[PDB]
Amino acid sequence: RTCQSQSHRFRGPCLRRSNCANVCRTEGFPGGRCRGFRRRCFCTTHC
């Protein structure tokens, strides 16, 4: 299953997906996508 958990240590909006991906991959996740109302990066992990 795909589980998306927000990037807590993320800063700014998820507009720059590079920053989203960087945070998510460094935190040990496959990828980061947008899923929050406030344009929050969500790391998509596999459950």
What's the rounded Cα separation, in Å, for the pair 23 and 28? 9
Query: At 44, which amino acid appears?
Result: T
The DSSP bridge partners found for residue 5 are 43
- Which residue reads 């720059």 in tokens? 16
Task: Take residue 3 and report the two structure tokens written for it.
Answer: 């589980």
Domain range holding 31?
1-47
Whole-Å CA distances, 7 to 18, 33, 38, 46? 13, 10, 12, 15
Compute the half-sphere exposure of residue 37: CA atoms within 13 Å on the CB side of its CA: 0
3-state secondary structure of 8: coil
CATH of the domain at 7: 3.30.30.10
3 state SS of 15: coil
Q: Report how many domains make up the chain.
A: 1
CB atoms within 10 A of CB 31: 15
Instruction: Please state the φ and ψ torsions of residue 35, each to the nearest 5 degrees.
Output: -150, -10
